[PDB]
Amino acid sequence: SPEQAMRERSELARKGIARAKSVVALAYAGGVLFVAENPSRSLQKISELYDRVGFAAAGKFNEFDNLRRGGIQFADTRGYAYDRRDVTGRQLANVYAQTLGTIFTEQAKPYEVELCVAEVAHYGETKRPELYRITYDGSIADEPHFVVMGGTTEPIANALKESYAENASLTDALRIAVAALRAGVASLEVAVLDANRPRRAFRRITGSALQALL
Amino acid sequence: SPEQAMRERSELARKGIARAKSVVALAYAGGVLFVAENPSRSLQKISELYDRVGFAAAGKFNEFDNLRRGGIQFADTRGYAYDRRDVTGRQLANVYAQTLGTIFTEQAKPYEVELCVAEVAHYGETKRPELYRITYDGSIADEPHFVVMGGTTEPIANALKESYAENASLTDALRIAVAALRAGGVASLEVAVLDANRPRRAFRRITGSALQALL
Amino acid sequence: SPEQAMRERSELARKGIARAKSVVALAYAGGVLFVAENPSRSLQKISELYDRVGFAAAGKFNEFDNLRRGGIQFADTRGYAYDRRDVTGRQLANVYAQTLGTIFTEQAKPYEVELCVAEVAHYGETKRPELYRITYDGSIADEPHFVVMGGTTEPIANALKESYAENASLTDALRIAVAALRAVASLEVAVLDANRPRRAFRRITGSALQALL
Amino acid sequence: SPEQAMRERSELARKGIARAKSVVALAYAGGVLFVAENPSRSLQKISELYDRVGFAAAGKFNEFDNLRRGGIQFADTRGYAYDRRDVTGRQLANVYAQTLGTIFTEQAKPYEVELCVAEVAHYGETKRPELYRITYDGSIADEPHFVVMGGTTEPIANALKESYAENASLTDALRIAVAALRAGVASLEVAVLDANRPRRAFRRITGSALQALL
Amino acid sequence: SPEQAMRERSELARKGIARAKSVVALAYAGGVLFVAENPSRSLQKISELYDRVGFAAAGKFNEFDNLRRGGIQFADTRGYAYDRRDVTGRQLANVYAQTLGTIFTEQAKPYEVELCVAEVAHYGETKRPELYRITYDGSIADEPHFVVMGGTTEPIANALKESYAENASLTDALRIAVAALRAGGVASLEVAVLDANRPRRAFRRITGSALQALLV
Amino acid sequence: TTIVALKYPGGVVMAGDRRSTQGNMISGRDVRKVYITDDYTATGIAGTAAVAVEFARLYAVELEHYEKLEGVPLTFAGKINRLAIMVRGNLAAAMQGLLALPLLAGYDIHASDPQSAGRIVSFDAAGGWNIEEEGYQAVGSGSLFAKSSMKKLYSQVTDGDSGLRVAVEALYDAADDDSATGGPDLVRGIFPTAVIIDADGAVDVPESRIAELARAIIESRS
Amino acid sequence: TTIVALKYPGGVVMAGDRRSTQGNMISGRDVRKVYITDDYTATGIAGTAAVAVEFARLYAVELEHYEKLEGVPLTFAGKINRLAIMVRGNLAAAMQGLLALPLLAGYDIHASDPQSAGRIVSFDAAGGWNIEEEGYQAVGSGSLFAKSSMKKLYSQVTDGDSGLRVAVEALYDAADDDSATGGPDLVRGIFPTAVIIDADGAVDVPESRIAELARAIIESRS
Amino acid sequence: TTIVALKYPGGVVMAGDRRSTQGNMISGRDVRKVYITDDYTATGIAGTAAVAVEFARLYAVELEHYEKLEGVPLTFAGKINRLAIMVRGNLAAAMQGLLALPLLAGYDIHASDPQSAGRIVSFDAAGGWNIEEEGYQAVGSGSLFAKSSMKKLYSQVTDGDSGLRVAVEALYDAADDDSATGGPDLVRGIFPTAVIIDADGAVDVPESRIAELARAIIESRSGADTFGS
Amino acid sequence: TTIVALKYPGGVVMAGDRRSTQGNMISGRDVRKVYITDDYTATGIAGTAAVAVEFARLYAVELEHYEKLEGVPLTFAGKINRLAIMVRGNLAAAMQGLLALPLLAGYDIHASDPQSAGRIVSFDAAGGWNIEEEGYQAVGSGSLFAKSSMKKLYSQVTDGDSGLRVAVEALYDAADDDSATGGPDLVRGIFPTAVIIDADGAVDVPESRIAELARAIIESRS
């Protein structure tokens, strides 16, 4: 029954992602901002992938951490086989798309995850941030302003949909992001792909320094 | 039930192709023209395969991008093992036919896609453009004037079936296509041609102001 | 349920072949004539296999083109490993029989195809043409005068049995072939010409196609 | 269920063999005689295996041709590894028994075939002919005078059961063979293992020569 | 029902062994004696395995001939690897037990067979003969006097159970055996013995006029 | 051995000698070294006979294999590449004494100008190929002699007939200086073999025509 | 062989000679050693012809393969690395006489200063690469003579024209001292080939242009 | 060793000597070097005995293997190719001292003209083959001697018997100049062996005809020696 | 070492010496070199002891393994072939000093004439075999001596016993000339071993008979 299985697996996945905490990523003046509901001190739902490329996920941790590692593996290998500047957010999204598509199809259980790959311009370069969302079945789509994943999204999506305004400051953006999440610091994981860093954009904003923003 | 299984598979693929945006490819005076409804800046539905061979698809992106890469792999390998001029649109269509046929048969899920392989004459050469359509089950067919894939085709097919003129200009051709497509803008269209006039690499994208203009 | 599967797979196959266009091959004075209903500018259901061995098929294109390539692979390899003259139709048919037999048994889906392998004598040699028919399940059989495959065969066939004459020429048999077909640039035609020195196979296309009619 | 499998598998083999043409093999003064209903000039059901060993089969061609080749493979390899005279009909029968047994058990579909392996004495030697029948299930059994396979056997078996004359003439056997065959020349495949031949016993009786004996 | 299946599987095997001809092996003054119902000119159910070890089987020929060959393979490899004296009937029975057990478990169809491995003492050793019976599922058991396999055993078993004599002679043992086999001639029988009196290879077939003389 | 090939307006001619040697001993008197590979191509191979023959045979099968499979012949460039790959693949064995060098001659059907469609391609032991642009080429132990001969005779090449004549005379000069190359054998009637290729395809030259050219060359030098 | 490459403001020119040798013998007079690899890159390879040709052909395919697959061209650094990998891969064979060394020239489209975008990269047998910062480089048996010539003539390279002219004079000096490098052949009309690359892409220099420069140089030294 | 083969009208004859050597020592006096491969083929192998024998045996099995499998014999060209492949395959071993060179003789039932259907094929160590057009060929340490002898005697070959005679005389000439080739042994009654092939198939020549022929050659040789100096 | 075999009417005898050496040093005095392989076959092996013993042992197992599996003994030709295969398989090792050469003797129960049913087969290091037709054969470091001795004595063989005596005398002659072969040792009572095979099978010859024969031979030489 190619049609029933497809539906069940798909349901099983959507449900898992639904019962998980929410994550949000949005474009902003200095880069991209990642904000996720994360109680744990040492478990990260947001991570650096390459020089200017970031990663964020929602769902089952062991499953998305697996994808995170694979992504890092792919990026480092490319950069080395060619050059660093040949690695791009589009390539990583494309890879995740193909990977999840395969898992969803040939693995025992679908991956209960939803991913977001983001990329900002290179230092001194001028380019519009890019955000990609890959879903448990390998579907891919690029959002122009923000991405929301995990749990009940609509409430966070709409809240942000009315809230958001590009070119916002880091703080106005951080606040808008948190509030949308609120619709649907010791409980927040925050990081940015900062377009002003010379090579490695990824940077965590934690502790007191996070407090001030908040 | 094998008869039943085959049916469910075809049904699943058809549904996926149906819920997807539409794509059109048509012959014209200077080559072949590819027009697709596409919001995205970065994810493409139309691509170069080889020197005079183009590719267009509709359906699930990750699945047809997979086929696109495989196609490029096949073409580059053949050209290298033999010579560039030995690679043809017919070979590529044939390969896709066999590939999709196998997927549709032995893979967990059929590929929710529909492909079009096009070829124009070599520079200074004189030959009628060729268009092929390969469906999700491996069925292949060559259309003489245009191909339509994705979503609700009949409306677009008929609209084009009447609108069509051989040797239309690029502007005229673009218009029939856009018009035909809505019957069933630039920040929502992916456009590219196989330009028979180009010396080696025919494929070229028409984007931005250049495209706007032609519209 | 080995018996049920066997029946379903078999049905699935027969149906596919049924919904496909028809093909006919008949022995004529001049060797073998291949005539098939085919509108395509670029897809062939009739092909050369080896020097004096021809191939014709009906059913799913990607599946029989697959078999066609494998046949060419087999023939070229044998001729090289031994000698050209050691390659025969009986041999190519035998291989297809074993191949389809295996597909029908161990593959996900049976091949919706029906094949015909034909062979004419070598130049200056004197031998009666041979025609083989291999079916989706690996069954093989050699017809003495003609073979019909694809779609609704009996009308075309039965028509053929009375219509058939031995040594009917390209034109006469050719029409009988077209007639059973009905029972110009939308048709593919080729012959294994026993009168050619090595490669018997040759396509009859364009203007020459109407002339023989 | 396991009984349903066997039951089901067994029925298919029988049905396949039943709908197939019949073949007969019988001992005679000069060797063994093979006679099968065959409308084909080019496709063979009777074949040479080794010096004094013959093969005959009924059922699906591609399947018993497969077995025929494997038999020749086995025989030629054994004769080469040891000596020609070490190859025997009993060995070949044994091998087929094991082979079909395995197919019937572990292959997708059973082989719709029934085989007969025959052996005559070596030149100038004096030994009684041997006939072996191997079924689709690997069952094996040696008949003292004749073997019948394919289609409806009983009719042919009984008809032959009546007329068997050990040490009959070649023509007698041929003649007898056709009738039993008939009760069930351009449509006959005839060959014998001629004990009188110095090395290779197998030889086909075709054309005018065959006519002569009818 | 995995167990239920393992039930049918087991009936499937038993019914094949049931429908097969019977075989009997018995101890006697001179060694072990093997007697089976066998019309065949050239297909054997009784065979030599090693110097003082014999083999007998009932069931599907191609399946027990397979086991016979594997047995010979095992014995010859072991003897060569170590020494001839290191090969014993117990080892062979143990190997068959493990083999059939595996077949019965992981193979498509169970083997429709029942085997008997017998050992006589080496030349000069005084040792009572050993008879082992291995069944289609890998069960093993050593009988002190005789073993019966194939077809309807009980009738033959009981018949033998009553006239069994230890230290019994070859002619006496032969007749005793042939009788019990009737309960459930030369042209129809395969006869052989592990003759403990032989210097190395105990196994030897009793055929033709000699078998004829013994039946006399 | 000496195999020559030259371009004439509208085509190519390739001819080879018939000698075979084992050291100083003549081991062959009528070896055929020029093969018609396909309708528009001819191959001539020098070096180790066993390998030379295998090459020509395999190469022709590979070309026809592609044609049947793809419905169309390989482009001339594809043909060159396939042959080069075959040579390169024999480099280890060649270093060990199994050296075989081919000479390729053909008529390119797809070339724009027919008078210039003739093609001559030489190969080195590593598979390196070169499309000859000067009109002629040669391979084998007598190739230098033949090439020096053709250099002074080439200007007389205006058609297939004068081409074939220059080819035979070049082979004659090669035999005159290289004991490993066989000259025309008048006593046994054995002469070089040759293939001509033009728009109408590759055709074996009749022995009688070569015999006439050979005898003329000889009477001339006499 | 001698292949030269020089930077000029806004671009690069690469030029190579036409000779081929087998020991002391001239085996080629019209070999093309400089290839346009992609729209902004040119490769010139010296050494074993078979290997050199294979390299250029494979390299171009690899570059275009990436472009079609990823939708954009490899960065210039990536191009260098890929070439370097190929060279490194042939080290074993090079040790055994299959040595081939490439010279890379290109225009970097992503470089900040366009008049400075020209790139010249040399490679050693182990795949070690070096982006030339002094303006010119050369590879092959006549490379020292060419480099020493360019050292004295480089100040003259003020544009792509004088650069092409200097390149040709360097090749001429190379052939004047290295018998394995072919000078301009006035009798046959064969001249070094050259590729120029600027912001508008890589282009083959017209033979007539090179012939004019060549004749002038000859008149000058006369 | 010396093995010769020649074409006569309507047939081919192949004959070989019986000697075997280990350096200078004679290690065999009755070795049979000519084998009937199939009904219309014969093989004679020179070189390392152990390899030579394996070749003939394997080759015969391969030819018969094809026939049984395909219902028809291999064409003569196929037979040649199969043997050449076998020789090529032994090239590494041959270099290590396991060299074996075969000589093939046959009658092609499919050739056009039956009087010319005879075939002779020689092979080099790399598997290179060559169909002979001059009527004769030889292989082994005495082959040069045998060929130069046949060159002067070939015009006497007008049928099977005169061909057999010339062959025997060529082997005799080889033994006369090559210590590794054995001449006729009158004391022990050991003579060259020979196979004859024509339209009716390959047949072993009876020792008696070969023995008579050999004595006749010897007697002729004695007479001629006495007549001259 | 020296192992001899001969044919007498209705049977065969094979006999071998008892010495073992490690250079010039005598390392064994009672080695048994002749084995009864099956009821109608005997094998004698010379060369490297370790390999020689393994061969005999493996060979006998392989003959009996065939018999048990197929219910019938291998034909004599099959026995020969199996032994030859074993020798060929040891060729590489033999070139490294692990050489072993066997000598086979047997009675073919399936031959036509029983008085001529005896068989003797010699083998070379490559596995080449030869069925001896002249009545006797020998292998080992003293084989030439033994053979030249048998050549002069063979005419005396008229029965099992006279054959056995000739075999023993041949071994004696071998020891007389080859320090690696051991003569009869009277002080220790060690004598050559021997196997006799006829229609009734292979039998070990009793030490006492060999000793009587030995002494008579010695007496006769004194």
Short mmCIF file of C-alpha atoms in Angstrom, two decimals, chain C residues 50-128:
data_model
loop_
_atom_site.label_atom_id
_atom_site.label_comp_id
_atom_site.label_asym_id
_atom_site.label_seq_id
_atom_site.Cartn_x
_atom_site.Cartn_y
_atom_site.Cartn_z
CA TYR C 50 24.34 -8.92 -35.35
CA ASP C 51 25.43 -9.44 -38.94
CA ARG C 52 22.41 -11.41 -40.01
CA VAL C 53 20.35 -11.32 -36.87
CA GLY C 54 17.52 -8.88 -36.31
CA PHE C 55 15.39 -7.76 -33.39
CA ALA C 56 11.79 -6.56 -33.07
CA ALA C 57 9.70 -5.90 -30.00
CA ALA C 58 6.39 -4.70 -28.62
CA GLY C 59 5.48 -3.42 -25.19
CA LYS C 60 7.10 -0.90 -22.85
CA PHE C 61 9.93 0.88 -24.74
CA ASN C 62 12.38 1.43 -21.91
CA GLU C 63 12.04 -2.30 -21.10
CA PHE C 64 12.59 -3.78 -24.53
CA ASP C 65 15.29 -1.23 -25.43
CA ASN C 66 16.97 -2.58 -22.31
CA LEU C 67 16.72 -6.09 -23.77
CA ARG C 68 17.88 -4.85 -27.17
CA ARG C 69 21.07 -3.40 -25.66
CA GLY C 70 21.72 -6.56 -23.68
CA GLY C 71 21.31 -8.58 -26.84
CA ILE C 72 23.80 -6.44 -28.72
CA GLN C 73 26.14 -6.78 -25.73
CA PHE C 74 25.80 -10.56 -25.80
CA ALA C 75 26.31 -10.91 -29.55
CA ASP C 76 29.31 -8.60 -29.79
CA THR C 77 30.96 -10.33 -26.85
CA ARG C 78 30.48 -13.85 -28.27
CA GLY C 79 31.65 -12.89 -31.74
CA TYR C 80 34.76 -11.40 -30.27
CA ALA C 81 35.44 -14.29 -27.89
CA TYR C 82 35.04 -16.82 -30.71
CA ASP C 83 34.27 -15.71 -34.27
CA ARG C 84 31.54 -13.64 -35.92
CA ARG C 85 30.11 -16.67 -37.67
CA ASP C 86 29.59 -18.39 -34.34
CA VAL C 87 26.83 -15.94 -33.38
CA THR C 88 23.33 -17.17 -34.26
CA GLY C 89 19.71 -16.23 -33.75
CA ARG C 90 18.89 -19.49 -32.06
CA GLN C 91 21.48 -18.22 -29.62
CA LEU C 92 20.16 -14.76 -29.18
CA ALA C 93 16.66 -16.09 -28.75
CA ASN C 94 17.85 -18.59 -26.19
CA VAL C 95 19.48 -15.83 -24.18
CA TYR C 96 16.35 -13.68 -24.23
CA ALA C 97 14.29 -16.68 -23.12
CA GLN C 98 16.56 -17.18 -20.11
CA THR C 99 16.67 -13.43 -19.40
CA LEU C 100 12.94 -12.78 -19.44
CA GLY C 101 12.46 -16.00 -17.53
CA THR C 102 14.61 -14.59 -14.76
CA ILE C 103 13.01 -11.16 -14.82
CA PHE C 104 9.51 -12.66 -14.70
CA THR C 105 10.59 -14.69 -11.66
CA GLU C 106 12.85 -12.54 -9.53
CA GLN C 107 12.16 -8.92 -10.47
CA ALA C 108 9.68 -6.56 -8.80
CA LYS C 109 7.59 -6.25 -11.94
CA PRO C 110 7.52 -8.49 -15.01
CA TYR C 111 8.65 -6.95 -18.28
CA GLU C 112 5.67 -5.86 -20.35
CA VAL C 113 7.30 -7.01 -23.57
CA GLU C 114 7.23 -9.55 -26.37
CA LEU C 115 10.30 -10.14 -28.56
CA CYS C 116 11.16 -11.52 -31.94
CA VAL C 117 14.63 -12.56 -33.05
CA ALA C 118 15.13 -13.27 -36.76
CA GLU C 119 18.04 -14.63 -38.81
CA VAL C 120 18.70 -14.94 -42.50
CA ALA C 121 21.37 -16.89 -44.36
CA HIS C 122 24.90 -15.60 -44.83
CA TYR C 123 25.77 -14.06 -48.19
CA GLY C 124 25.76 -16.62 -51.01
CA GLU C 125 24.64 -19.23 -48.50
CA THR C 126 21.34 -21.03 -48.87
CA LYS C 127 19.25 -21.40 -45.72
CA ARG C 128 15.63 -20.92 -44.68
#
